[PDB]
Structures are given as C-alpha cells and as structure tokens.
Amino acid sequence: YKLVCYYTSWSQYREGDGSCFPDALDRFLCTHIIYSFANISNDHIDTWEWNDVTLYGMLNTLKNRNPNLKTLLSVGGWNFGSQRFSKIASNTQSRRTFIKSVPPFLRTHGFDGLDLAWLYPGRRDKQHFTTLIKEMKAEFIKEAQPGKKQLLLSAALSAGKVTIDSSYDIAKISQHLDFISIMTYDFHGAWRGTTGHHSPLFRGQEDASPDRFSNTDYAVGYMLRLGAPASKLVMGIPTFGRSFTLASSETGVGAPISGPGIPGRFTKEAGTLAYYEICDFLRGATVHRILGQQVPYATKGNQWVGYDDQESVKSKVQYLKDRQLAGAMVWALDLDDFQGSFCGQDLRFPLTNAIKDALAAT
C-alpha cells in the first residue's frame, strides 16, 4: 500500500519543539513524502519559502539510505486561492508555460513528481481542471519518452460532495492521475455552531448528523462510484484535530459552541491543534469514543476537540483495506508527534507509525 505523507514548509518556523525540518523526518516511515507547497509566479512553478531549495535537498536526502522513498512537490494548498490557479489553467498560453516549467524544476530539485492541490476548481473550471491534468501527464510522458523514470502526477481532492460535484470530473481525470488523495477531514467547522468531529469514519447516529455526506465512508464510496479506481485512491487521515469553545455544560456531539477552540501553543491557530498539542490537552481531559463514527473527541473545561489517535487510525486503515484502496494519506507529518516527546512512549510519529503498522498487518 502507498503511504503518502505531507510535510509543510511553514512548520520550520514554530517555537521550540514545534519547529520541524525535513531532516527530522523518518525516511522509512512513508512511501511518498509530499512537500507543501510550491508557488506559481509568471505562470512558472517556483519556490515559496526563502530557504525552500535547502529544505528540498534536506528532504530528498532522505532518499539516499532509502531508494524506494518517492518524493513529490505539491502546488496549491488552501491559502493559495483558487483565483490564481484558475487564470493559469484557464488561459491556453499560461497553461503551457506552467506545464513546460514543471519537469525542469522537479528534475533540478530532485523531486519524483508533482501534486496538484487546487482548492478548488469552481463549476466554472471543472473542464479546465481536466485539461490541466490531461496535458500535465502528457508533458511528463514526453519528458521521459527517451527512457527516464516518468514523473508522477497526483491530486489532492476535496472530500465534500458539493465541491466534488461542481469541481471534478472524477472518471476523466482518474485516467491521467497516478493516484488521488481524498481529503477526508475538515468535515465539520465552527461555522456550523455545534461540536462535531471533523473526520468521522462513518455517519454514526443518524439523528445527530447535520449532513448525510460529511464523513469518510460516504466520500470514499461516492468517489469510487464516480469512477475513481480503488487502486488509485488514497484515503486521507488527519494528524490534527478541530477544536471548539463550548458555550454550556453540554459536551457531547452537537453541543453548543461560541466559536473555534483556543489556539495551540505551537500551531497558534484557533480551531486547530496538532496531535502533539492534543496529547498535552489530554492531560486531565476526558476522551469519548463516538459510537458509529469510530473516532474520539476530548473535552476539558470549555474546550472540545475532535481528532484521530492510534485506535481510530487503525480502524480507518482496516476500512481502506476492506475497500481495497491504494493506501492512506497523512496530513501532516509535522502535526504528528514527530518529536515523540509529547505523547510519551518516546515513540516518534505515533499516528503515522500506527497507520504504517496497520497497513502491513494481517
């Protein structure tokens, strides 16, 4: 099975032990490590961080002692904005410029492929997205025609039905992509005004779910139904949790909230907590297994957070295997306990390692 793991270029700037550099990554943990994110200037793929070139090499060095490890450079991301992507994939000239600039850039920096993370093509770009992927694969094929190891092309897709229906032509793009990572998380947000796990495996109690499609199981099946070969589908598992600030004494699923949770000491982002920040939170907190959804949530004081732990990711792997999917995708390596000092056991990357172990099991 493939174990696609993301690494973010901005985790390096986190205070103390929060700081994470590519050399802190276990070269044997994943099968594919994707760097996030690359920028796009003058219709050319380009670096984002001032020291990207250094971190690129720092990451690709992991391939020395592990020849099987594959590396990809992802372009896009949430903070990128669909606007910029649209103008490039929409204009016939810019699309060419962009596509042509990718292979050289990847070879120059030691990457094995490109990962498209365009969030998200509007209903107005559904076809342009198809053309982009179609031509990008064409170029990659051409660039390796003489006998090179062909560059890989992947795409991180939304797991939300509405977005999937208006943005993707699953059947068409599945032919050209080497593998698809479905972002099966971020299913519930403070905007909803109630507590809810952002990455449940199944819908669970029919009575308490605001949506029939906001869960991993639905998204996976839907995409399979739409024409995404199971052999090319990688299921996303989050190593971060979504938090909320409770508004009453109610702490169960669906309880009232006043907004996102208090920012974590290291990630400093309201509504977000890295798994390692969660391990701290768990000290003196109560953990509840959500029956039906197969995932846990912890609560302490006026804070509530839905996340994934070793037990839940295990179940999720079981699910993906029973489904015969390509494997699991993790977001992100720098959100897992990479130091291995926060959750005890002195074990590094507990969640990701748990996923790896589960994939090899049975």
Ligand SMILES: CC(=O)N[C@@H]1[C@@H](O)[C@H](O[C@@H]2O[C@H](CO)[C@@H](O[C@@H]3O[C@H](CO)[C@@H](O[C@@H]4O[C@H](CO)[C@@H](O[C@H]5O[C@H](CO)[C@@H](O[C@@H]6O[C@H](CO)[C@@H](O)[C@H](O)[C@H]6NC(C)=O)[C@H](O)[C@H]5NC(C)=O)[C@H](O)[C@H]4NC(C)=O)[C@H](O)[C@H]3NC(C)=O)[C@H](O)[C@H]2NC(C)=O)[C@@H](CO)O[C@H]1O
């Ligand atoms: C408004 C309304 O009422 N309408 C409703 C809709 O909202 C509902 O749809 C839902 O919309 C939300 C957004 O509103 C969707 O959420 C997004 O989901 C995607 C995945 O599908 C997420 O993207 C990927 O996952 C991670 C984690 O979520 C993303 O975030 C990381 O990346 C950003 C930048 O790219 C990081 O930002 C960094 O921040 C630090 C400091 O904070 C800074 O120093 C860095 O510089 C900065 N980085 C950069 C480069 O700028 C951020 O910290 C990361 N987060 C975490 C945690 O790690 C990645 O970008 C994505 N990864 C990949 C591989 O692409 C996306 O993050 C998320 N957006 C938000 C705001 O959280 C949601 O999917 C929709 N739901 C569904 C199911 O479709 C709609 C449906 O219910 O209902 C409407 O009514």
Ligand SMILES: *[C@@H]1O[C@H](CO)[C@@H](O[C@@H]2O[C@H](CO)[C@@H](O)[C@H](O)[C@H]2NC(C)=O)[C@H](O)[C@H]1NC(C)=O
């Ligand atoms: C990524 O590339 C874009 C180019 O599209 C850069 O955006 C420019 O930002 C500067 C201000 O910082 C503006 O003066 C330009 O007009 C912007 N260009 C446009 C039209 O978007 C962006 O700065 C780059 N990001 C990084 C991290 O380097």
